[PDB]
Design a protein around this ligand. Structure first.
Ligand SMILES: C/C=C/Cn1cc(-c2cccc(C(=O)N(C)C)c2)c2cc[nH]c2c1=O
Length: 126
């Protein structure tokens, strides 16, 4: 049993960019979520092998985690803020799809998502 290769955090063939919105996503949004008490299970890809979740990557085909997002932001991997927002939304959605409603990990994701939405509500223009 193995985990898939993690999502790429850079790619020489994908145009790269920095915008004030992407700077906000790294400096304000990611930072705020990263330090939350519930953040640690989301700071790296799910190790389905060590967690003994053999069906995890049979079900979740678009994995995403905040460690990947952090590195993408640091590497200027994204062209725009929408791409990064989509990664956050993919992470939350994956958690709601794989896990039973009311599971602790779901409650943790829900708290992180509420904070995410509060922070992105003030995403600056441009
Ligand atoms: C990238 C984030 C994915 C979210 N996620 C994380 C873990 C997980 C990851 C690492 C550690 C732990 C853990 O040991 N906990 C929460 C006690 C859980 C887990 C265990 C069952 N379902 C999930 C799950 O959906």
């Amino acid at each position: 049993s193995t985990n898939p290769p993690p999502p790429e955090t850079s790619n020489p063939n994908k145009p790269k960019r920095q915008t004030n919105q992407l700077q906000y996503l790294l400096r304000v949004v990611l930072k705020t979520l990263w330090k939350h008490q519930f953040a640690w299970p989301f700071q790296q890809p799910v190790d389905a092998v060590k967690l003994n979740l053999p069906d995890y990557y049979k079900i979740i085909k678009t994995p995403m985690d905040m460690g990947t997002i952090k590195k993408r932001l640091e590497n200027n991997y994204y062209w725009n803020a929408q791409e990064c927002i989509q990664d956050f939304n993919t992470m939350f959605t994956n958690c709601y799809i794989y896990n039973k409603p009311g599971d602790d990990i779901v409650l943790m994701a829900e708290a992180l998502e509420k904070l995410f939405l509060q922070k992105i509500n003030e995403l600056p223009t441009e």
